[model samples]
Target: ADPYDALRRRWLGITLGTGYDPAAEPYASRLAETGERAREHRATMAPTPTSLWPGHPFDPPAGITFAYGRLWTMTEAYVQEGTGATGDPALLADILRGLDHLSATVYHPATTRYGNWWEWQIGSPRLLMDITAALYDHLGADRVAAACAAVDHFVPDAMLGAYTGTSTGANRVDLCRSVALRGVLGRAPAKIALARDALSPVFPYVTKGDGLYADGSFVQHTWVAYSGTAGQVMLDGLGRLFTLLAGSEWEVTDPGRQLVLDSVEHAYAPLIHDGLVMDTVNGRAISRGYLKSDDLHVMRSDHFHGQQLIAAMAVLAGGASNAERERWHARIKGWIERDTVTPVLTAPQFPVADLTRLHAIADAPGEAAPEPVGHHLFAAMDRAVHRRPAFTAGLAMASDRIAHYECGNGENPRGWHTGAGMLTWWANGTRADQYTDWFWPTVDWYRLPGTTVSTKRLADRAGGEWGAPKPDVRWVGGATDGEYAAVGQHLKGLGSTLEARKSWFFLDDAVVCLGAGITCADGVPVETVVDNRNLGEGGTQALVRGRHWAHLEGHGGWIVPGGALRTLREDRTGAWSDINTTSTTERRTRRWQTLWLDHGTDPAGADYVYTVMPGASRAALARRAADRHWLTVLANDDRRQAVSVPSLGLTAANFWQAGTAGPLTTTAGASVLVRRRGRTATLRVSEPPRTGEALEIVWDHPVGAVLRADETVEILATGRRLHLRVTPGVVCTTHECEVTLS
Candidate 1:
């Protein structure tokens, strides 16, 4: 049979249209919009194609990629069914003229690569292949061969070139996409097979460099946690490949492909809240959009990235297993329903295929799943996420394996402290665009939440770009029992001589923060940021601070145990260009509430303890702080940080060295968490550095028998002092065990 024809038709249906009704709501709007876009391109398209936009000039080869992308959009409108430009002879003539002009002048086979390599390798090839596929029948055979030759010249092989660094992870997926499309256009089965087989390295979990990890962490650029931007690109490209090669021969038979499917929930779903991807994992990409544009209602930078993930999930659900399909459908439906600020289905950028698929999922007969509740400790990427019924918090940390900050391609130059134990959160019943709406450009760089900084001014791009500037510490992981966690970072300050031990205990009602051994020789005052919340433009949220507590209205509450807290309510002004060099220089202002504790200049053995109660009412916070039985600080010093919640019967400890804390003790620096429910108890332990050494844990309580335990866990003594030996795996993952108390 004709497998090439099958692939072509499948690609057209998924990309352009299959049976989308033009009379429907979103489809009707999209049809008109596509026609408008095509006309706009036609009106501005130069007869010679010199300079398409202001900055993209054909002489320098910068605007050539943009010119090709616009032509592809116009070609889509001409080939797509039920559009105003569909079957229009004039539009086709303009597109053909523009395509010839570009190929003859800027994008010819004899042209040498210039500017960014992406413009030549991935961007131009991808658009040109799609355009050729769309206009295969309309264009002459000479033109089709010319376009194919251009693609081949840029991307000769699907599996050649370096497999590490620049060409790994999401970049590899994009390259394969171009190769696969070229194969479809040229009808080369071997090329198609090469494209399919080239994706082998990306499927499995990687221990060191770029790829997905077993702990639901996606890393790109070797060290950055990029589940938002790069991760979305990987998902989208793979989803299309899986659909394009479905029944013909390359159906992605690799079992490791399941890791990509599982990541939709395990990796992505946790970072997204109410259809908005948290900016913590977005890395420097959070500053990629228009921050000072007058059209606030229409321009979506980071939220647009989130919507891309939503559409990627829709496409991936088509080839997913039956169980995964159902769960993904439910989750996608919920995000569509909840995201009122920027509705996914009605978003203008979605193609007909994504629009139709998402609409079906939204209208299907299934109950919308609620927000998940638990803790996700992605130790591999040095990041953590905690979710409750009413709020979600994302924590960023840096170690020897992960970078403290990333700055490259002239973006996020001032993101010096993003990985320095910064905590960003979102609350329910509030605007979804908290961090996306001008927060990055206006907030103070020195006072990020949950960070300890030296207040001494430093130059932008302090550490460097893809270098992913990291500290010389490896104790930056945690232990989680799926529902709760004990996360710690033995931090050596970025660009300063500040060493401290910081730990966060995530529980049901609140998050307890502890810092000890804060010794710094930077000759500047060091301060620990408790919270830095953005209150929007000209916001006047009530800030009430007492001797030992502070509460911001409509946000949440913070309790400082020893009563040394300073508050500042001020308006900060900045421009996006201040951080990212490529953005506009228009200035903007917004009100912010910052809270911190001064550790004094070059302090020795200083410490602080605090608790953040997200989504708690003022009265509820007051009552909880006043009641001594609610929570107890078991230990807070240079060697250990521990806490106990008597009401919940949960005790968590982080041992910096071999010592005891509360009801748990460990040897050679380990994280331990114990949850007691009646006679049964669940214990979690992990070696932060993944040393592979046998670490011993002794719970100062009597236990009768073992109920369940992981393979890495071994029960030693069980009578009075419950002792266990834990052999940590090489990947630095958590290990758990359960026992019954006498």
Candidate 2:
């Protein structure tokens, strides 16, 4: 009848599962793996068990991961059904002794926190609290108090007091887990309430710091776009709390809690394609990985993080509304179905609990929702995604608000150009595992797709740690009308004397990439990589090129007008240790199809115009090459980069100064996308610099009247002038103004 008992039981069901089917798949394999791990842990147990595992430091934080690993193994064996070790008396005694040893020596209340404080504060204590909850029946009152005391000494309170750095977003949710679990064990209602209440700060969106932005952008460590790793942790931790407190007296009553549910589709879904989170926003996590086999070094595979997110979504759906739940369930099912390369439910890295949750959703789902077809610009994070029926492309850019790349903890040491307008795309009917199949270990880091680099050799971690090397330019976002977008960035190259104005116009079937003002005094050849696609295992994808166009067999086509294109199809060899510095240096080789436009050394006023057609055939490339007016470049210079797609009746422009591009004229720098269909015209404009000045725009077309407009926009005149005023600083947001043109 006790509320804490019910809460504890629910927690156990989610973690260890209730109905144990040892004969079923995933769970069956997972149980077998757990048994093997338990046997190994048993064999590796220390003689005196000070550090528990050999070679693991016992002084402070490094030992925390080892201690937690042992506790987790014991908990899985003791509670998981079908494990022969389950409910075994000897295993329970061993677990008790292990817990006692950790509490007395390594993780006691009086132990001074050292090394990575997170290990002491959140990681070790979280598992210890869970272990106590799983074994509450056997542990005496003193034993229970000891576990709670250890958590309290490190976490102390839900509001982490002076340590503000570690008490926000995902870290805050982790702290709540420790405090709330400790409360459940100690039976303190006030601590439980405090833990739940401390999550209030994370609910609403933020513009300047770490949290989810209103535009579905999640930032952590201040400026790093971490929707793949830290965002998943936040979702999982919050979803667990939402499920744990649902029927209890401490159920989360804050209305703002709905933000977490809304974020499933907004912040996470766009970045995922075929069940893979794009590495463009994955930040420095691309370098962290483990040796999967003798030949494969799985360096943070996209599916690995994607499956974690899908599992989090399954747990999160329980607390969502009916419509939200069904939509989310359908999305999860769709991702599972399309993720044929690395099946989400069957990935060995995931725990059985996640597998079980995902399996239920995948089984009882309605029609699997199709992948969305649209353009999403996460202006806050300086990232964008464009999806058509045939392809999905992601763009990563850097501005004053975002860093060029992030490297820390000995990870992503060579990730210097990840955020300098790197374009990553995956086409339909092709293997979606382009980036997954040893791409990071083998691909050239400097030649990342859609980047303008000076070809200058750089040292590891050149930009600094934790996303510290941001460009001074602020004109780095774009304007999107959901269906299409015109994204631009005034790129000031990282660690080199290179500057370029870049723009991408996302349309239905093609993405038009434009570069201008590409002047660099670094005394090196500057190149703009049209694409550097991983050709999977075989280094033999057919590469056919014309004077101005190139197409890699089965991948896509690129049309570079008036620019001499160079192509290379060869084998590249690298290792995880090359980027991570901590991972094993096992060599990995993969074929790559690289295409670039070389701006001769110390070039001035160099520019390029290319249209990337994902899933385009060689014939399509020739057709596009012949049809020069299909996408007319109205302006391609430092002042502006504008294009007019006459076929689509669309005019997209990135205005760097006061200029006229086709029919649109702006008084200041802005990103503008205008589409005219019949008598209705829609205008989407944004100031990427976040300058609060109002930009005066004149359409030069006659408009009858304004249909709708954002509050930041004002109609100055209508008639042939079609004059308007746009002011930014609605958090650097976009302004949509629809008008009926005459």
Candidate 3:
């Protein structure tokens, strides 16, 4: 009994069990629509003997003709046939012959390896496996051997031992899945066995080292986080393996396998809001959302699609217990609404069985999840996302370990974007989405909202580019005690050669932002861009009362220094004109506005303090700005940067070097977040250095005794004076820790 036969049974049970309703949406429509020309190509494809496929400039004339695009169409035609739809069976035999040619071709893995890693490692092999599984009924040793040998370059035994190919980020899963594919397709269990170990490094959630951080960050390649890209791949790959081996002889349960479940909740869920994932944590895929549709055919890079991580979630649901399944199903429904999911379920990548099940769950009736409004921080990734009732905001920062933005690759050449302290927020659904869709390609790259950047042009990137190897900044994290999340960064501009301490305190209705010591060399004007937004359909209105207060459109109010704002607008500019963002860029033009505080070139010291009130009407914003009691700037200098929202009973401070702020005096490399609810308080002390040692904190307030620390911290009460020994292990592992005081 061939091992692949077992896999064949699972594949058929999983993929070929049902014919979707012609009324079943894009499933029926997908096959109907996608492969018209490729269908025509395959019907006339030669039967037996064939030389190398005609050369395209992008590909060599080494393998078969039109293998890249045509194989996709052939897979659809074969899948359509299995589902009892109209398909060309003769193409199946042609597919085998093509596989034979691909198998025999001596393609050098070394010379052939270049930029197209996806197609060679994951994409094409996946299609090869799909075709093999589709032809199982008629597939013999010849067919299996040919298909397996075609992808024989994916030798798990060698790659796993060498480790570089399969031991990092998404590649681990890619190589692992490929190895497993070859193993099952070739009936070699040992290769399949090596596949699991290949992913042993990334299998668990780590806090200090590489792999997926427990805080929902995934680092791969050069220790770059991609919780959305490679992490998404890990979720799907490990998830499939978990299901495939469940209750089998090769079941993988070591390390509890809870890490897979953990990632879905912590890593992916944070970025996914209202079903659509934000593009901030998407790494290199920053500009991916707005690419041409044809460029996305081979892969879905856009987080705009609600189904970005849908299939993986659905696969996890398959293995979940009934209760867990129901819970997971509900999450899936929330991620992708029924209407949006219709065509996506029909997508060829998803298994019909799981898609059908998910469809049933969507229509099965469920309650909406409670509105999750609060601070969600990604400490390891140097990013923070706040989901409030009025608006949701995401911040991206860089530290010794994190990059400001992903390298350019005809994608997001968003150079020097990290130190900008870029903040992307949204009030209305369309408003939050405007940046990614309308403003991304057309807007000024230097003037991204909430970023303190230099007015210097970065080098143009053509094929690909990377951000500076390491972050110029070190103090790059904040603390959140559920509500009132405080974020701060001791920013060292990667290329701008500037230093600034910036902090943001999330209040109930408003976010108080403060910046200090914004000075730069190279004689470039430094700017702290408060916000850049699309000129709304209602038309953008900028009313600046000479630095007293200004309201842009209807979003919020900016409380600026006395006459400190320069309202800049670019009418109908092309955002993608420069970087293009994708393989093929689009000529998208839109009117955009930028509101910023100019910190003059070569200044020894400059600073900015502002409050952003989302959901505030123009008139309301002016009122809030005029009210002195609205928010307080606690400390705004190199010693410390803090903001106090007395109305919200919160004080969030980022102490550049530990000093005194109100009643708290701490050491350097700490972020202080304190929230008081009547008599009880949640005090979070965030340590941001690589120091694994404990911090000594002195509280000169009338605070009560220590109630509890999230983990373990020594609290000493010497009568009127109280001291805290925030131990080393806790701070480094969790990045920040909170304690409740009575």
Candidate 4:
């Protein structure tokens, strides 16, 4: 695959920086110098040091076990690649001698103590594995085997099993590294396989679909470092194995291919969201702050870089489509370029003496000493990655161009899972810019409903309550579909209402309003609703009362209930009630009504008045309405007469010309018409007609009012009565009338 070639090139290039071969003398000299620095740093460790550095005025003294382990592995990689050359051999020998000395002195023997070899820092085994392999391959097997036997003695059999603690407590990165080392050494195949099998159950707990969640995104917690770091190790190790196995005639199955594909896809998902995979699920967004931990004094930034590289390799090896591969490459390259391009001083670099002295001032009593003041290369790398055009373009597109028109609100902060929005937009080739702005408004409304409404009301009560236009409403209809209407209102002590209604249309999608009501300080509305999605079940069509909105269906079925009544049904199993009584219901028509009379401010001071209506007909539907102004019905088959009212209003002129908001003039009312036939007989009012005269048409026994050409109509007040006349087949929609001041 093209991706594979790209990956191989990238790996080789990174491994061989500036075209310097690891087998050459120059490369060996650099590696030896790095190894010597590592040795000196470890050698300076004091007994029970409180930090990484000690005995200096600025630095805290503590053991840096993980750092040493990591450095050992990196240096060993260079040594292994350098086979049998003058400089390579010498460097290799020095690195092995240093590792052996460090391991024997630093790691305690016999007892599996808290900070022992078999403890938390699992990657230590990888260091051991690398040193043993390098020495065995180069210096001879006997010496390396003896060193490995010593390592095995320190690790023993005590720490071999599944870890049962917190979700991220188990050192998964180390576990993955252990597996890789097992394969690398060509020993303990069965043990490695067993460990892999043990990991299977926990895999689902970490992974979400094709992507991994940091711990879990559930409950608003988004610590992704565990998953991201561990996932990288798994991907890289498995990739190495896959390469080795491929040459051995191993047949790749569907699951195997899926594993590689899923790993790559998961890694890209989060990295693409925030430049780096987040430390937690809830911590998805990158914040430039750190919280101290007891053991690892300084929060790590290296895992992100390593993971990005691993993910790139997987993307290349998994045979991803060209577009997908390019997207992945763009993201990884962007991160690398962003982080590496800057020369910003991430942290102050202090001498060994200063590093020790600073610890006394920074550390709290009994708290673990802080990390030394050293320049963090990873932070510099991050800055460079962010500066790249490709990286910025990719991130910008992912954040900005994606269509995530869903709600980003709820009671739980963690419930704010915007990844769906993020991923959807990214896949569609949108840049990741200004994406947070679109989400914050809705999220803020949901989180602080009271404050949002109160502030709006305080600013302008009338404007907040009835002046401002209602929030946008999107309707999704299909067979067995549901509707989620999120309305933003600025009523005093009111909250944003999210109405969810599921239709019973098993195979056809039809819009049916199950329930619509407001949520205020007191409570929500109670009204009887209808269920037409399931005709076989014959649901009740009841009247709902108590601050309720009428349910009008596109199928010419309308139910104005007196109170909020939930429907219950008896199936073959037993009687069952739908969890979301506001949405799901069985089919049945029953006249139900209830009215709540407020007795006082007290909770118990409430009374209900009941009324019910029976039957189903056009006349019944029309008669159900108390006033024509309160109800507007459209014919089921007539799409032309379906009125798309921006909101309930009667104005002298149409301010919105064809959807564009403009000034209102005499001709503005011409567009607002109550049509009789499809583009045939229409009732429209216009100012300054050809004859320059005003005319008002009052038809029959005033069932409706109409303003003829050359007239102006104005809305008087709320609940203004308008009488009009209509023929049996003729319908009146968007009935607007002119106001006359007498």
lDDT value, residue 238 of candidate 1: 80
Give per-residue lDDT, candidate 1, residue 616: 77
lDDT tens readout by residue for model 2, 1-742? 9998888888887777665467788787778767777877776777354577777767657676676778688778877776667788877877887787777777886777778888888778888888888889998999999888888788887355433677877788889888888888899998888888888877988878688999999887888998988778888889999888887899888999988888999899998898988888788877766643423333468877887777888888766778998999898888988998787877877777777778778789397887889988999999999999879999999988898999998888889899889999988756689888888888898899999988999989897899999998978888888999999989988899999999999998889999999999998899999999999766676788776888878888988878678888888887787877677777778888888989999989899989999888888877887886677889999999999887787989999988999888999988998888898999888888777788988888888988999998889999876888987774557788899988
- The lDDT of model 3 is 0.63
**True-vs-predicted CA distance for residue 74, candidate 2, Å:** 1.4
Q: Tens digit of lDDT per residue, candidate 3, span 1-742?
A: 5555766566555554443454465455444554564566565555333333443322433233246446556665565633333455666666666665555553223335545555566666766776666665666877677667656664425656654643565666666776776777677787777776666665656665457776677665444556666555666677666665555455565674667776666777666665556666666665654445553344333344335566667766555457767767777776555223224445544545556656666677885453368877887877788877777777888777776666755656654564358887767443234554455556677778888877877765421355445556667777777666778877777565778888887777777788888778867788888888776433556655524777765566667645667776666545443555454444566767778888888867687788877666677776776688766677788788877777666767777786987777886667777677786666677687747567777766556555666554677663465567776443333323233444
Error of 4 at 468 (Å): 38
Ranking by lDDT: 2, 1, 3, 4
Using all chains and alpha carbons, the TM-scores for the candidates as numbered come to: 0.93, 0.95, 0.87, 0.38
Provide the RMSD of all predictions against the true structure, rounded to 1 decimal: 2.8, 2.3, 4.3, 24.2
Error of 3 at 528 (Å): 1.1
Clashing pairs in 3: 21-24, 53-65, 404-418, 420-451, 441-575, 441-576, 442-575, 547-563, 658-667, 658-668
Predicted model with the maximum TM-score? 2
Per lDDT, the best of the predicted structures is 2
- 365-421 in candidate 1: lDDT tens per residue? 997887778999988888899988767888999999888878888888878788889
Q: Write down the lDDT that model 4 would get.
A: 0.28
In model 4, the Cα lDDT at residue 654 comes to 20
Question: Which candidate, 3 or 4, has the higher TM-score?
Answer: 3
* True-vs-predicted CA distance for residue 676, candidate 3, Å: 2.3
